[PDB]
Amino acid sequence: AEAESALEYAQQALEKAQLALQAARQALKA
Amino acid sequence: AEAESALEYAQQALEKAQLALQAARQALKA
Amino acid sequence: AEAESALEYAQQALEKAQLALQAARQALKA
Amino acid sequence: AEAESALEYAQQALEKAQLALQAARQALKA
Ligand SMILES: c12c3c4c5c1c1c6c7c2c2c8c3c3c9c4c4c%10c5c5c1c1c6c6c%11c7c2c2c7c8c3c3c8c9c4c4c9c%10c5c5c1c1c6c6c%11c2c2c7c3c3c8c4c4c9c5c1c1c6c2c3c41
Ligand SMILES: c12c3c4c5c1c1c6c7c2c2c8c3c3c9c4c4c%10c5c5c1c1c6c6c%11c7c2c2c7c8c3c3c8c9c4c4c9c%10c5c5c1c1c6c6c%11c2c2c7c3c3c8c4c4c9c5c1c1c6c2c3c41
């Protein structure tokens, strides 16, 4: 199930990217 | 500063997502 | 400005990646 | 091949996010 594990990992990485992006967007408002 | 750091981190996270995605795409070909 | 717009676009693109990833993960379960 | 198509789409979306992120990071240098 390397495929499944890879997609689960990619999803988690994307989640991390998203939350950092929101921090950056807030920083820019400021 | 925090914005720059957040974008740097997001880029690294996206790179990790991309490499996992490539593994997954190869897995499906098999 | 351009930075804000770029981050907005990146977030939308990440959202699209996430929803496709979820479809893919369901496809593999099947 | 909905799974394959989904991953190909997600990869393209991530590519778009990456290129916008690089624009944003350059904007911040400035
Ligand atoms: C977010 C978390 C994660 C993301 C969110 C982003 C911002 C903020 C939070 C949050 C905390 C989280 C997580 C964690 C990650 C993660 C990411 C994410 C980015 C974002 C930036 C900010 C922002 C602050 C926010 C705090 C907050 C802490 C939280 C922690 C961790 C942790 C860790 C990661 C990591 C990254 C990285 C990004 C960077 C941004 C900034 C700042 C900083 C804030 C801090 C710090 C905390 C701390 C660390 C690191 C670390 C650093 C770094 C970046 C820095 C930076 C800062 C701090 C670092 C560090
Ligand atoms: C990038 C392209 C794409 C990304 C790169 C980012 C920046 C720049 C280029 C580039 C051109 C690309 C693509 C295209 C996308 C895409 C994205 C990406 C982001 C980035 C930002 C900048 C930046 C400029 C740069 C030019 C450049 C043009 C190029 C085109 C398209 C096109 C289109 C998308 C779209 C997004 C969006 C982002 C946003 C950023 C900025 C600005 C703007 C620059 C322009 C403009 C051009 C134009 C459009 C749109 C559009 C807008 C918008 C964001 C804006 C914004 C600007 C322009 C918009 C528009």
Author numbering:
A (entry chain A), B (entry chain B), C (entry chain B), D (entry chain A): 1 to 30
Could you give the paper's own sentences about this structure?
Crystals from the resulting suspension grew within 24 h in several conditions, and three separate structures of the C60Sol–COP complex were resolved to 1.67, 1.76 and 2.35 Å, respectively. The interaction between COP and the fullerene group involves non-polar contacts, with C60 fitting perfectly into a symmetric hydrophobic cavity created by helices of two adjacent COP tetramers. The dominant contact appears to be the π–π aromatic stacking between C60 and Tyr9, donated by each tetramer, while several aliphatic carbons line the pocket to further support the bound pose. The water-solubilizing Tris-acid side chain of C60Sol is not visible in the electron density map. The group likely points into the solvated inner channel of the crystal and is highly mobile as the C60 core rapidly rotates around its centre. In fact, in the fullerene bound structure, no contacts between adjacent COP tetramers occur outside of the C60-binding site. Inter-fullerene nearest-neighbour distances in the C60Sol–COP supercrystal alternate between 1.2 and 1.7 nm. On the other hand, C60Sol–COP supercrystals (of similar dimension as protein-alone crystals) exhibited high electrical conductance (1.40 × 10−7 S, corresponding to resistance of 7.14 × 106 Ω) with at least four orders of magnitude higher currents than in any of the controls.
In this work, we demonstrate the first ever high-resolution structure of co-assembly between a protein and buckminsterfullerene (C60), which suggests a simple structural mode for protein–fullerene co-organization. As in the protein-only structure, COP forms a canonical tetrameric anti-parallel coiled coil. Each tetramer presents four tyrosine residues (one per monomer) in exterior c positions of the coiled-coil heptad, and each of these engages a C60 moiety. One C60 is wedged between two Tyr residues donated by adjacent tetramers, such that two tetramers are needed to coordinate one C60.
